[PDB]
Amino acid sequence: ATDRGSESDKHFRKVSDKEKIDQLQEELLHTQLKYQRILERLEKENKELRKLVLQKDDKGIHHRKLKKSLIDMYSEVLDVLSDYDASYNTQDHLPRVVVVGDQSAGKTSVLEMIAQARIFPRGSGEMMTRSPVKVTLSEGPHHVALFKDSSREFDLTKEEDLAALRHEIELRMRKNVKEGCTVSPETISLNVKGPGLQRMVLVDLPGVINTVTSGMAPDTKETIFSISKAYMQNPNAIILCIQDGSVDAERSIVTDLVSQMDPHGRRTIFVLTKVDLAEKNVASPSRIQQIIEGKLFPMKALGYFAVVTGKGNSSESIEAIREYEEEFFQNSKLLKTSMLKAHQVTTRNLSLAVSDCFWKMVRESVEQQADSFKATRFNLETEWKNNYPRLRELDRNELFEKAKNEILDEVISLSQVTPKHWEEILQQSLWERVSTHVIENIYLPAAQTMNSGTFNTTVDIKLKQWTDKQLPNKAVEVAWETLQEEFSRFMTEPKGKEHDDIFDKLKEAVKEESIKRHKWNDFAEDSLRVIQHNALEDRSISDKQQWDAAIYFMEEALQARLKDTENAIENMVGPDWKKRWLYWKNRTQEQCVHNETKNELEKMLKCNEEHPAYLASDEITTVRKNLESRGVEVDPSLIKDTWHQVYRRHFLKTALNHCNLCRRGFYYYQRHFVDSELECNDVVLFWRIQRMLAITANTLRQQLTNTEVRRLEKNVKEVLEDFAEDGEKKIKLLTGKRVQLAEDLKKVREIQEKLDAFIEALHQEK
Amino acid sequence: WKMVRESVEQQADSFKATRFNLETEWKNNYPRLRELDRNELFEKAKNEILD
Ligand SMILES: Nc1nc2c(ncn2[C@@H]2O[C@H](COP(=O)(O)OP(=O)(O)O)[C@@H](O)[C@H]2O)c(=O)[nH]1
Ligand code: ALF
Ligand SMILES: [K+]
Ligand SMILES: [Mg+2]
DSSP structure string for A685-736: HHHHHHHHHHHHHHHHHHHIIIIIHHHHHHHHHHHHHHHHH-HHHHHHH---
Q: What is chain B written as a DSSP string?
A: -HHHHHHHHHHHHHHHHHHHHHHHHHHHH-TT-SS--HHHHHHHHHHHHH-
Q: Distance from CA of residue A645 to its chain's centroid? A: 53
**Integer Cα distance of A8 and A408 in angstroms:** 17
CB A208 within 8 A of CB A253: yes
Disruptive mutation site among A8, A11, A21 for chain B (greatest number of B CBs within 10 Å) = A11
**Integer Cα distance of A208 and A243 in angstroms:** 12
User: Considering only alpha carbons, which residue of chain A is nearest residue B7?
Assistant: A16
Check residue A615 and report its DSSP letter: P
The answer to whether the annotation marks A109 as part of a ligand binding site is: yes
Chain A residues within 8 A of B17 when measuring between CB atoms: 11
A15·B10 Cβ contact <8 A: yes
Q: Does A12 touch chain B (CB under 8 A)?
A: yes
Pocket test for ligand 2, best of A98, A110, A116, A128 (most atoms within 8 A of CB): A128
CB A99 within 8 A of CB A204: yes
User: Considering only alpha carbons, which residue of chain B is nearest residue A20?
Assistant: B6
- The dihedrals phi and psi of A494, each to the nearest 5 degrees, come to -70, 150
**Residues in chain B, overall count:** 51
**Integer Cα distance of A288 and A85 in angstroms:** 42
Chain A residues within 8 A of B10 when measuring between CB atoms: 12, 15
Question: Ligand 1: residues whose CB is within 6 Å?
Answer: A 106-109, 112, 122-124, 128-129, 273-274, 276, 308-310, 312-314, 316
User: Within 10 A of A708 (CB to CB), how many other CB atoms are there?
Assistant: 23
**Integer Cα distance of A253 and A242 in angstroms:** 10
A15·B17 Cβ contact <8 A: no
Q: What is the resolution of this structure in A?
A: 5.5
Alpha helices in A438-543 (DSSP H): 444-446, 452-469, 471-492, 504-516, 524-537
- With b for 16 or more beta-carbon neighbours within 10 A and e for fewer, the A487-520 pattern comes to beebbbeeeeeeebebbbbbbebbbebbbeebeb
Disruptive mutation site among B6, B7, B13 for chain A (greatest number of A CBs within 10 Å) = B13
- The dihedrals phi and psi of A346, each to the nearest 5 degrees, come to -45, 145
Give the minimum alpha-carbon distance from B35 to chain A in angstroms, rounded to a whole number: 24
The answer to whether the annotation marks A104 as part of a ligand binding site is: yes
Residues 6+ apart with CB under 8 A from A91: A81, A82, A85, A230, A234
Q: Does A29 touch chain B (CB under 8 A)?
A: no
Instruction: Say if strands A143-147 and A96-101 run parallel, antiparallel, or are unpaired.
Output: unpaired
**Integer Cα distance of A158 and A257 in angstroms:** 39
Q: Distance from CA of residue A10 to its chain's centroid? A: 36
Instruction: Write out A155-215 in H/E/C secondary structure.
Output: CCCCHHHHHHHHHHHHHHHHHCCCCCCCCCCCCEEEEEEECCCCCEEEEECCCECCCCCCC
Q: Does A21 touch chain B (CB under 8 A)?
A: no
The answer to whether the annotation marks A47 as part of a ligand binding site is: no
Q: Does B13 touch chain A (CB under 8 A)?
A: yes
CA angle A524, A526, A530 (to 5 degrees): 120
- With b for 16 or more beta-carbon neighbours within 10 A and e for fewer, the B3-16 pattern comes to eeeeeeeeeebeee
Give the minimum alpha-carbon distance from A531 to chain B in angstroms, rounded to a whole number: 22
Q: Which atom of ligand 2 is nearest to the CA of A127?
A: 5
Report helix angle A504-516 to A709-725, nearest 10. Answer: 120
Pocket test for ligand 2, best of A109, A127, A134 (most atoms within 8 A of CB): A127
For the Cβ of A140 lying below 6 angstroms from any atom of ligand 2, the answer is no
- With b for 16 or more beta-carbon neighbours within 10 A and e for fewer, the A109-138 pattern comes to bbbbbbbbbbbbbeeeeebbbbbbbbbbbb
Pocket test for ligand 1, best of A112, A127, A246, A345 (most atoms within 8 A of CB): A112
Chain B residues within 8 A of A11 when measuring between CB atoms: 13, 17
**Integer Cα distance of A245 and A104 in angstroms:** 10
Among A132, A185, A144, A142, CA closest to A168:
A144
What is chain A's percent helix, strand, coil content, to nearest 5?
65, 5, 30
User: Considering only alpha carbons, which residue of chain B is nearest residue A13?
Assistant: B10
**Integer Cα distance of A549 and A690 in angstroms:** 9
For the Cβ of A106 lying below 6 angstroms from any atom of ligand 2, the answer is yes
CB A317 within 8 A of CB A265: no
A15·B13 Cβ contact <8 A: yes
Question: How many interface pairs between A and B have CB atoms less than 8 angstroms apart?
Answer: 9
User: Considering only alpha carbons, which residue of chain B is nearest residue A8?
Assistant: B14
Q: Which atom of ligand 1 is nearest to the CA of A274?
A: 28
- The dihedrals phi and psi of A207, each to the nearest 5 degrees, come to -70, 135
Q: How was this structure determined?
A: cryo-EM
Chain B residues within 8 A of A19 when measuring between CB atoms: 9
Query: Given CA atoms A657, A661, A662, A664 in this order, what sign does their dihedral have?
Result: positive
Among A503, A450, A429, A453, CA closest to A610:
A450
Centre of ligand 2 from the C-alpha of residue A490, in Å: 61
Q: Which atom of ligand 1 is nearest to the CA of A312?
A: 25
- The dihedrals phi and psi of A357, each to the nearest 5 degrees, come to -70, -25
Strand arrangement, sheet containing A143-147: A143-147, A188-194, A133-139, A200-204, A96-101, A237-244, A268-273, A306-308
CB A455 within 8 A of CB A415: no
Pocket test for ligand 1, best of A103, A109, A127 (most atoms within 8 A of CB): A109
Q: Does A15 touch chain B (CB under 8 A)?
A: yes
**Could you give the 3-state DSSP secondary structure of residue A628?**
helix
Q: Does A24 touch chain B (CB under 8 A)?
A: no
Among A179, A181, A186, CA closest to A216:
A181
Q: Which atom of ligand 1 is nearest to the CA of A129?
A: 21
Give the minimum alpha-carbon distance from B28 to chain A in angstroms, rounded to a whole number: 15
Q: Which atom of ligand 2 is nearest to the CA of A105?
A: 4
The answer to whether the annotation marks A107 as part of a ligand binding site is: yes
For residue A223, CA distances in Å to A89, A101, A219, A543, A547 come to 18, 15, 6, 88, 84
Among A127, A177, A120, CA closest to A145:
A120
CA angle A381, A383, A389 (to 5 degrees): 80
Q: Does B10 touch chain A (CB under 8 A)?
A: yes
User: Considering only alpha carbons, which residue of chain B is nearest residue A14?
Assistant: B13
CB A289 within 8 A of CB A259: no
- The dihedrals phi and psi of A493, each to the nearest 5 degrees, come to -70, 135
A398 pairs with which residues across the strands? none
